[PDB]
Design a protein around this ligand. Structure first.
Ligand SMILES: Nc1ncnc2c1ncn2[C@@H]1O[C@H](COP(=O)(O)OP(=O)(O)O)[C@@H](O)[C@H]1O
Ligand SMILES: CC(C)n1c(=O)cc(N[C@@H](C)c2ccccc2)[nH]c1=O
Ligand code: BEF
Ligand SMILES: [Mg+2]
Length: 711
């Protein structure tokens, strides 16, 4: 009828009222008072007022782009930040504290079925918990979104839910320790970028282990590729890792005296290239939270002091000056003395190793010369290696405490990756980050559209394959397959004559005008652009070969191994071959095969605007996120297909109480048929497969309401 949506240049779609029709064209008055003429096929129907702010968009009469965008916008305007989209959930960043995560709320969500409670991260957490115990299988909570969308907040809320549930049924309980793992990792692995004041600069997969009846038993954390480069480098509107500024806050004066540092971040080259303060962050308060987290995780005084000392030694390492008399020599030794003292090394030995590294000639050696540029590069590389290895030690140390030896049967794994991002300058680390996001989107596409339809086919369910246009194989292959971007980088690696420009020429010769997703770029200079699922990203390739090989001055690595500071010697103990991109690809492939053995639960976080503004929706930004995430198609397959299915044996066991008189039937399929036929249900909402009974969206929920009533 008259109530419609029409396309708009600024807001994507607006509400309108049809005034007239003629020659395949429609004349309509918009909500913003504009009288518009558009083609008939561009006109989409508004859902009835009874579907306003609906909790599950799979139940809408009209399913289209503005129906979804407006339903989400209307819910958001009422601070209802979660919405169901078929079997998965969508969430929109509120950018403000809401009273939706308290203990009375966690208690009320316990054991609630999806429909009898509003959409929430606690209900996603609870539903995964109910499938885990009923099916006896591992679960995964996969939280997607761009940098700043709310992945980390939603991850911390999943952890909070299970720890508070366990609280009802080192220097703290397991529950208290799982909660403290995030503050500790965040001080060292998170930082202020343009898109997020607390950007996660590493990915993580947290496994929460449970016993047979659901008691919280243990936890483990796996982290992925930390952005090492931030330790020594910052762009204009960004900060180094939180920890540097947390220490400098002077909230612990003993720390400043122990690290031989001043209170000013601008006195330290490595950490003051961009911004040093953030309005939303109290670094003094954050230092306390970090220090307390180490205590709760049972770190010793010696373990905490060593992490502090190494952080402080990295600060002094950046202040080491070199000059000429092409051979470099130290331009002072004060900063070198401070570093060596904190690192349990000899100052004069360290400077000698930096200016004159050795090249191995069998069981003999030849001294190599270093210009100032070579020394400052090597000094930067060592600082990054100390930091990343210290970060890895901390993860290992947290895992030792989280390991209880209490009984385990299943887990719920929560994945919180570094989000898709676009800066003014995008380097190797942005490619690594964006590639992970593309892979995570393809895992969603494969589960929702490929495996789903293949399941119907192998089960003998009458089905016509639907091409949903959700397939990222072309861009993924461009980055990861042989002769792709990383394969070319890896091959240009271990070529003594290779340079950034030979690497660039090989990229261009193989893919420019040949690979659809590879383009020439358009403000800092860029070398190539990549058409990712979430946008076109301009990449600068300077330093990628050195970043991928990751060479270290092995003369000073040897000194690290002989350090009187136990932590430093342990960090470089096993030091000895794979490139960082080859290891990243390997770890990513391993993650994806492991996730395939779990029941996934997708949570799609959406950033509402670019200005951290609470309650304001940037319509093209929100629509773009919904489009590249496959939200509409994900809902279509839930409406069109059979989202629920149960093995005949499990079906007759669980739903016999619904009508025991109907099955007083040896064969479970015969049993399932007669049981279902005897019930007051639409006998078209279910289909019989070879091994499972398939259900239309909503029938499982109804069967479950009916069972909860008989119990
Ligand atoms: N559901 C939420 N409730 C309140 N604030 C939130 C929520 N989600 C995100 N935020 C805010 O947005 C910021 C960025 O979110 P975050 O989880 O760090 O993003 P991501 O990990 O996806 O990059 C947070 O620091 C917080 O201020
Ligand atoms: C999402 C889907 C493939 N699915 C189901 O559609 C039903 C499952 N099991 C039944 C037995 C169940 C009923 C009520 C609560 C938990 C599990 N498992 C499933 O994984
Ligand atoms: F910046 Be968020 F951690 F993706
Ligand atoms: Mg994060």
């Amino acid at each position: 009828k008259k109530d419609v949506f029409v396309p708009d240049d600024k807001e994507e779609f607006v509400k309108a009222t049809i005034l007239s029709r003629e020659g395949g064209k429609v004349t309509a008055e918009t909500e913003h008072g504009k009288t518009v003429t558009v083609k008939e096929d561009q006109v989409l129907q508004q859902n009835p007022p009874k579907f306003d702010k609906i909790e599950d968009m799979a139940m809408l009469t009209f399913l289209h782009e503005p129906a979804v965008l407006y339903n989400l916008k209307e819910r958001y305007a009422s601070w209802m930040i979660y919405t169901y989209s078929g079997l998965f959930c969508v969430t929109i960043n509120p950018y403000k504290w809401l009273p939706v995560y308290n203990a009375e709320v966690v208690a009320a969500y316990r054991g609630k079925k999806r429909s009898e409670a509003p959409p929430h991260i606690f209900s996603i957490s609870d539903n995964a918990y109910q499938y885990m115990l009923t099916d006896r299988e591992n679960q995964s909570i996969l939280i997607t979104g761009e940098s700043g969308a709310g992945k980390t907040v939603n991850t911390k809320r999943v952890i909070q839910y299970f720890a508070v549930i366990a609280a009802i049924g080192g220097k703290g309980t397991l529950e208290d320790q799982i909660i403290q793992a995030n503050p500790a990792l965040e001080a060292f692995g998170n930082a202020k970028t343009v898109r997020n004041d607390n950007s996660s600069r590493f990915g993580k997969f947290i496994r929460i282990h449970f016993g047979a009846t659901g008691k919280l038993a243990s936890a483990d954390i796996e982290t992925y590729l930390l952005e090492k480069s931030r330790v020594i480098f910052q762009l204009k509107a960004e900060r180094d890792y939180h920890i540097f500024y947390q220490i400098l806050s002077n909230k612990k004066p003993e720390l400043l005296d122990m690290l031989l540092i001043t209170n000013n971040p601008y006195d330290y080259a490595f950490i003051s290239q961009g911004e040093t303060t953030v309005a939303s962050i109290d670094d003094a308060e954050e230092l306390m939270a970090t220090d307390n987290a180490f205590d709760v995780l049972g770190f010793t005084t010696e373990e905490k002091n060593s992490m502090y000392k190494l952080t402080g030694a990295i600060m002094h390492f950046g202040n080491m000056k070199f000059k000429l008399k092409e051979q470099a020599e130290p331009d002072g030794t004060e900063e070198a003395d401070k570093s060596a003292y904190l690192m349990g090394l000899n100052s004069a030995d360290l400077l000698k190793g930096l200016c004159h590294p050795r090249v191995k000639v069998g069981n003999e050696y030849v001294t190599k010369g270093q210009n100032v540029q070579q020394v400052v590069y090597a000094k930067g590389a060592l600082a990054k290696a100390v930091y990343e290895r210290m970060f890895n030690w901390m993860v290992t140390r947290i895992n030792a405490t989280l390991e209880t030896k209490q009984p385990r049967q299943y887990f719920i794994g929560v994945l919180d990756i570094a989000g898709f991002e676009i800066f003014d300058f995008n380097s190797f680390e942005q490619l690594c980050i964006n590639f992970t996001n593309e892979k995570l989107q393809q895992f969603f596409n494969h589960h929702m559209f490929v495996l789903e339809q293949e399941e119907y086919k192998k089960e003998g369910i009458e089905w016509e394959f639907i091409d949903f246009g959700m397939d990222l194989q072309a861009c993924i292959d461009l980055i990861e397959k042989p002769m792709g971007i990383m394969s070319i980088l890896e091959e240009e690696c271990m070529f003594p004559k290779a340079t950034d420009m030979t690497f660039k020429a090989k990229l261009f010769d193989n893919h420019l005008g040949k690979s659809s997703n590879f383009q020439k770029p358009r403000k800092p200079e860029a070398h190539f652009s990549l058409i990712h699922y979430a946008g076109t990203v301009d990449y600068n390739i300077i330093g990628w070969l050195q970043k991928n090989k990751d060479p270290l001055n092995e003369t000073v690595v040897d000194l690290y191994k002989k350090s009187s500071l136990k932590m430093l010697s342990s960090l470089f103990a096993n030091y000895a071959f794979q490139t960082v991109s080859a290891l990243h690809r390997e770890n990513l492939n391993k993650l994806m095969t492991n996730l395939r053995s779990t029941h996934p639960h997708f949570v799609r976080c959406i950033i509402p605007n670019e200005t951290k503004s609470p309650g304001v929706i940037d319509n093209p930004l929100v629509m773009h996120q919904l489009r590249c995430n496959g939200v509409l198609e994900g809902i279509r397959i839930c409406r069109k297909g059979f989202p629920n299915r149960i093995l005949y044996g499990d079906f007759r066991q669980r739903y016999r109480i619904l009508n025991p008189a109907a099955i007083p039937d040896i064969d479970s399929r015969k049993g399932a048929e007669k049981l279902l036929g005897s019930l007051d249900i639409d006998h078209n909402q279910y289909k019989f497969g070879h091994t499972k009974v398939f259900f239309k969206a909503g029938l499982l929920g109804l069967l479950e309401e009916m069972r909860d009533e008989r119990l």
